[model samples]
Target: STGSATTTPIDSLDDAYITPVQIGTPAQTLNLDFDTGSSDLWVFSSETTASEVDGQTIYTPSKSTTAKLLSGATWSISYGDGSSSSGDVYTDTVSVGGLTVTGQAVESAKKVSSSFTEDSTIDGLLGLAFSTLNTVSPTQQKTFFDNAKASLDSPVFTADLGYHAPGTYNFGFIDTTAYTGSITYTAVSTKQGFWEWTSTGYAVGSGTFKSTSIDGIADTGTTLLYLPATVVSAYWAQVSGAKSSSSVGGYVFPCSATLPSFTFGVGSARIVIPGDYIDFGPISTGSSSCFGGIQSSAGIGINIFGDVALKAAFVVFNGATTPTLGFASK
Candidate 1:
């Protein structure tokens, strides 16, 4: 019952529009994208200059009597999409759905880049991933769940995403009644950053390909499924019309066809990638396209499973309960 509302696509980033719970009573309305990659809550602030805050939605704290900002603490974030923003920090009573969280720490951006300045449809990202990679320090850390978990009617969080149609995405309450079996859990490595994992291999359609089985990390902060060059090349080879080319000093494939269905075996779980996500759109230099679902990070060191791969399954980052990642049937 948590994700009973409709969803809308946010640009071509493979994320959908979700209803946000406003901070304070008679809650104000805002559009937010539920992301599992990072654990921080952010919104556009009115303190930002109009020119610097053009395309994204800006939340003016002055408009909400219950809104509050922490004095002196400044915040900034550099995203994988080549965009960045910086601002002061604040805390206030926040709410989502029917839940309200008090003293939630948030960033009020004073400066933002053109990439964010140009998009009018997207407001800001609401990270529901894990607490390990939190951008906010523990002294100032506050999230929707951190507050709602104590007062919510239940203790589960669910995100239901509809690919073409609107889907319901929920938090703070898990509906085990809808599931048929026990949830599978994977122990988290004692790493410093986010909750990352090692992927053994990928399977497309009925054909499976194995990777070096090296340790990789699963990130919700990223938007694309980044793989090693060897794995990407081999996977692209299986596509009938897929051709590889160079752009931005990296390889991109051009094909409008549906890609093969791929599954990543992480521990005991198989996270699936639908075929349609394979075509990444047009390249800037040529008329070719890049494989949408998987791409090369140009030796970024770790392979990140972004929104493209996360969309195919229901992921639960239970940092409050245990140092593990749980995968369940959507």
Candidate 2:
């Protein structure tokens, strides 16, 4: 299999990045979040009772002649960030950026949780996590990348996320021009079905890099960077006008204040996140109070490298032996 395709992830105006995919024989297109945090390709569909859905397109298998129902199999998924959805399974042809995966298990949601119903733009989730994390019962489901990998030039996908700008997720091959400097690779420990890695160290602003080992997952589905409370406290301290607001649910700062840089070490690579990126837009339109992207991971046991940090680098998800994650400045 030597085919390839590339998807430009649409920046959903400070929320999540959306990628387009087609399902069924006739190809019904839907905009979904290509989440690296989970492993179930679920969509709001005809099976989804209208009451469970909100302002989003649904995929209808009845409209496609080639869709095959998978009896006795169902999928239910709840994310680390509180979103949940449950659905029935069907085997259909799924395509992304022109590359097709035939007879793919496409989970069409019968019900979606409150978190999903409120996010109107997101129609569903295209989980890119390891297939082992798939939520199907009686049989494990394969991810689109997993099913299509045999036909790829290389078993590698690259994520080129930009700061509040359009990004690209290339399947099968890497686009060298997207980044500068040599790619720094770090072996991922996916025992938990995530692209988990240990940061060699971290720093706040011009502070010295502390050699504190921190384990985290690189999750594209997450909107903010989640770190330990201790680390989060230190980061917010650097911002002169920063304050922890109960209403905002995280630290917020004066929009005019210049923030500090946050950096972390991955293997031998040093990834630095700019100050501007840390100011996660605003709490509301025309508000001078901006939420800090770096927040506490108290409820969640592990760290999450969300869009705030991911957009600063070109990430390569290499599914080779001992699967590795390669990073380079974009």
Candidate 3:
């Protein structure tokens, strides 16, 4: 079987990508963030605290005839941004695009962090990372992708994230029309429960491409591109007035500064991120200081090629017996 779903940016910042998913029997539709950085299909539901329930949609299992409680099962997860959510578990039919999976674990949020409650755009998150990352207790649960893989025409999915334009998450066969040239395939290490790979090298603006190895994960959940301090410094040095600001949390520069493009090697192919994408938005309302989309991974344990970098290309997450990743220019 094959399926495809559109993903849209909830706000101008493109902080996260939202995809509509239908859960349970009566088909309650909720907007969810398809996160490749984590593995737990959790959502805000009738069980959530009233105070944590903002204007976002919530799933009601009682309304679905197919819902079955997974008694005593619970889950908790914390994100890099400090946002967290914990919940009980239920088994229900979950549908994404046209593909449907029965008895999929649908975690119900009992508690959520402020960032999640305040966002209001996403009801929950559907994790695409490996099932090993699943936090469900007693027995770990599989991700939506894991359960649906066996039924899919191919055990793979593709992510086409656009700038401000509409993008899509595709299952089964790869769409030839979505990308350009040929895809550069690379091996992935699921040891850490992430679609992690090593980038061949990088180039800042029009500078010479550096021949080096950088290990990083392809994370759609993360908002920015995090690299080694040396690489981040090299990129920021080109921009006038760009500096690491303790007050701003990361690298910041004049909003009007002309940012140079960033490029990273995928085998012999070079995926280039346009300069406009690096100019993340103003630090504050009407502030002249703009946040840099590319920042140092000093605090972070590993380099991350997040949405800022992923949006520039077409990515394939091949969940074969030996998982691998493919990157192609779009």
Candidate 4:
């Protein structure tokens, strides 16, 4: 079987992209963030408090004949971005595009942190990471993709995240028409439940590529590129007006500052990022201050190839016994 779904970007938080997912027997639909950084399919449900949910849609499992409570099973999850949520569990039918999984564990959020409550547009999270990272207690649960992989024609999925445009998540097959040039693949390490890989090196502006090994995860849920402090300083130095500030909480530069293209090395593959994309919009409302999309991931413990970096290329998530990843230019 094969499946494909279009992704929509939240203009207010322009970096994050979300896709529609259908849940339960009658097929109630909801917009969910397909995250590769974590593993747990959770949503705002009838269990949520009225005040806890903003204007976001809530999933009412009672409406579906196939929805059944998981008795004592529960799930709690937290992210590197500080977002957190906890709730009980339900087994129901979940579908993505043409792919469907029966009796999939769905975490019903009864409590959510401020980060989620503030982002009223996000109704839920659909984790695409390895099932080992699932937060369900007593027993870990499989992700929708994990449950449906057996039915797929091929165990593969491609993430074509766009820059200020609609993209797609294609499952069970790779569409060569969506990208240019040959797809360069690299071996992946899934020991940490992440699509972890190391970039051979990188270059700033027209600078020569430095062969520093940078380990990171290809995380669709993360908003920006995060690397070590050393790499971040070198990148900022290329921008004449760039500076780090405590108040802004990161490297900030003039919105109109002329920037140069950045490139990363994966094996022999060179992925280029447009200069303008580095300016990640205004840091504050009605201000010319813009945050650098690439920042120091020093405190975060691991580097992250977030949306800012992923949007520059089409990504293939290979889920084989020995996993691999493919990157191609758009």
Q: Over the stretch 1-330, how does candidate 2's per-residue lDDT look in tens digits?
A: 433334444443456888888888788988889888888999999989888788898899999888999999999888876778898999999888767889989999999999888877788999888999999999999998889887888898877776767778888888888899988998799899999988888898889998888899988888889999999999888888888888878889988889899998888788999988887667898999988888999878889998888888899989876789998986
Model 2 lDDT on a 0 to 1 scale: 0.85
**What are the TM-scores, per candidate, against the unseen true structure?**
0.84, 0.94, 0.99, 0.98
lDDT of 4 by residue, 163-274 (tens): 8888999889999899999899998999999999999999998899999888999999998899999999999998878999888799999888987888988789889988
Output the lDDT of residue 312, model 3: 98
User: Candidate 4 — worst ten consecutive residues by lDDT sum?
Assistant: 10-19
Candidate 2 TM-score, true structure as reference: 0.94
Ordered by lDDT, highest first, the candidates read 3, 4, 2, 1
The candidates, ranked best first by TM-score, are: 3, 4, 2, 1
Name the weakest run of 10 consecutive residues (lDDT summed) in model 2: 1-10
lDDT by candidate, in order shown: 0.63, 0.85, 0.95, 0.90
Off by over 4 Å in 3: none
Superposition TM-score, candidate 1 onto the true structure: 0.84
What is residue 319's positional error in candidate 2, in angstroms? 0.7
Candidate 4 error regions (>4 Å): none
List the candidate 2 regions with Cα displacement exceeding 4 Å. Answer: 1-13
Clashes of 4: 0
Residue 100 error for model 4, in Å? 0.9
